Amino acid sequence: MSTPAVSHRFLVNFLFNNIPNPFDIAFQRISGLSRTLEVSQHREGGENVRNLWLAEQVNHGSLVLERGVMNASPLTLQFDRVLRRESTQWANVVIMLLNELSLPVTTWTLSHALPVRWQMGDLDAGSNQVLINTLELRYQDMRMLGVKL
Template identity: 45%
Template sequence: MITPIPDLLPQRELVVDFRFGVFFLVGGVAPNPLDIRFKRVKGLSATVKTTPLAEGGQNLYTQRLPDGVEYGNLVLERGLIVGSPLHLEVEAALSLFKFAPSNVVVTLFNDAYVPVSAWFFFKAYPVRWAISDLDAASKGVLVDTLELAYARMQIMRV
């Protein structure tokens, strides 16, 4: 009879992607509860840019040297909220061209709502806003989409 080998690694729960909050940190003030709930967050990405360097006499390949980090824009989607302070900031940026960059933290929670991971975005500001199509035949929720550029991102594992 063969005895199974016990698993030496502790059992870990799978991390789910649907318990999260988005927190805008403006001047040390607690975030407005209207502006932390989003339906979807996209664009959590970073890529190391490289520069090719050809070496003399080497024709089979080139060296690729790291040349900096490039970030995708952070895209936030939610149902339209009337009277949102965040919307006022977006309106000032897009209509008056007045920008007030803020730090943004996207936090992922486990089933007990304890943070398990987070992404910190430094000096974020709006670069695109869109709203879903208005359709008299649809009974869907009107979706507000906000796209943010930022200086850099820091991944935080808890």
């Protein structure tokens, strides 16, 4: 059987409408994409032994990203504009894992992602650590691709 996919190589591509060039930014800690369907349980009168689950509404999670405090990229300059309320532009994000050669084995492809939260790491006098800042986006739809679905 083919070997499963490990989780320490990944590219992320962003495409805003403010910014003319699509840019690719390296992260440390992409959190993880959930997708819940939100059923509800109904209880019938004469039926006491089975359950009844009724499908309603697909809920998508959130894209939480982590990287170090490095030079100003086109994405930390873009969260600065949205969190100062100077723009409300959102982007189409493409996230993909890479195998041993270079090849994309799975792709996640988020749509209309909106920057909603910046979170700075701690400043501590005895710490021995890189200052990590936490970024967080809310998207509208999600569409996973690739050969390793």
